[PDB]
Design a protein around this ligand. Structure first.
Ligand SMILES: C[C@]12CCC(=O)C[C@@H]1CC[C@@H]1[C@@H]2CC[C@]2(C)[C@@H](O)CC[C@@H]12
Ligand SMILES: O=C(O)c1ccccc1Nc1cccc(C(F)(F)F)c1
Length: 248
């Protein structure tokens, strides 16, 4: 249908991190590249979102808010997809010029977090997620985290989230036969989406601390990345902004 054409048509393309693979691996270089990749990946997310159906309805402030709160969850989820479709979850495919292997996962000083990411990446396979399901879930991640005191126009956001959830159902109801698996498939995806939040929160904490002592470890932080991680992120780790789980 129309909805599906849009999502597949506004799906961001390949994005390099600009990492110089000629130089030996070093924490500084690796994380600095990831930050640069983040800044780059953020530009596409902004445009990707503005081109999203009904997104232009939210108040301009809520448009930037939701983007500054779930950018981590979106990029991680998408990255997990590339890893599955490119290297079959064997490694973390952040970018064509920035693939993480067992070694780099250790050199990045965040091996545990990578494990969970390589785990999310494998879920796409264990559950046999389809392209249509992936695209629909990613968009729903954009509307998966908001401040406890709601947004400027919560009503509009709830209906916007409600409608995207409906699209997921239709996508799911376009290949099933009996309800035994139908209403069941919904349970699987809803779980997968929720498993993303925990991972995202761990990375949030990590980038935060890394930013605090960025000068001592010589890790560069792009302008935008620096403002969001110091102004937006803190609100999440403080409890002001909490994700939206389907299950408890
Ligand atoms: C979102 C990015 C970059 C885009 C992506 O593919 C997922 C990946 C997950 C780890 C993030 C990284 C951006 C830079 C961060 C936030 C580092 O500071 C620490 C964790 C890194
Ligand atoms: O377009 C609006 O008026 C709208 C308003 C609030 C929430 C969602 C909205 N539209 C919307 C929301 C999800 C999916 C689709 C569609 F699939 F039709 F494109 C349209």
């Amino acid at each position: 249908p129309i909805f599906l054409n849009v999502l597949e048509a506004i799906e961001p393309g390949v994005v390099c991190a600009g990492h110089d693979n000629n130089q030996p691996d070093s924490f500084a270089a690796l994380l600095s590249s990831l930050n640069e990749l983040g800044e780059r990946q953020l530009v596409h997310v902004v445009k990707w979102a503005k081109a999203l159906p009904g997104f232009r309805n939210l108040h301009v402030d809520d448009q930037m808010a939701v983007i500054q709160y779930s950018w981590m969850g979106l990029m991680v989820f998408a990255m997990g997809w590339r890893s599955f479709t490119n290297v079959n979850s064997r490694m973390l495919y952040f970018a064509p010029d920035l693939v993480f292997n067992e070694y780099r996962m250790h050199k990045s000083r965040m091996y545990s977090q990578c494990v969970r990411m390589r785990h999310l990446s494998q879920e796409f396979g264990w559950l046999q997620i389809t392209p249509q399901e992936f695209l629909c879930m990613k968009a729903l991640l954009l509307f998966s985290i908001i401040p406890v005191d709601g947004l400027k126009n919560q009503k509009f956001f709830d209906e916007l989230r409600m409608n995207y959830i409906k699209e997921l159902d239709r996508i799911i109801a376009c290949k099933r036969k009996n309800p035994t698996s139908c209403s069941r498939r919904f349970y699987q995806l809803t779980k997968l989406l929720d498993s993303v939040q925990p991972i995202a929160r761990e990375l949030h904490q990590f980038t935060f601390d890394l930013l605090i002592k960025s000068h001592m470890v010589s890790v560069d932080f792009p302008e935008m990345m620096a403002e969001i991680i110091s102004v937006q992120v803190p609100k999440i780790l403080s409890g002001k902004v909490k994700p939206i789980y389907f299950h408890t």
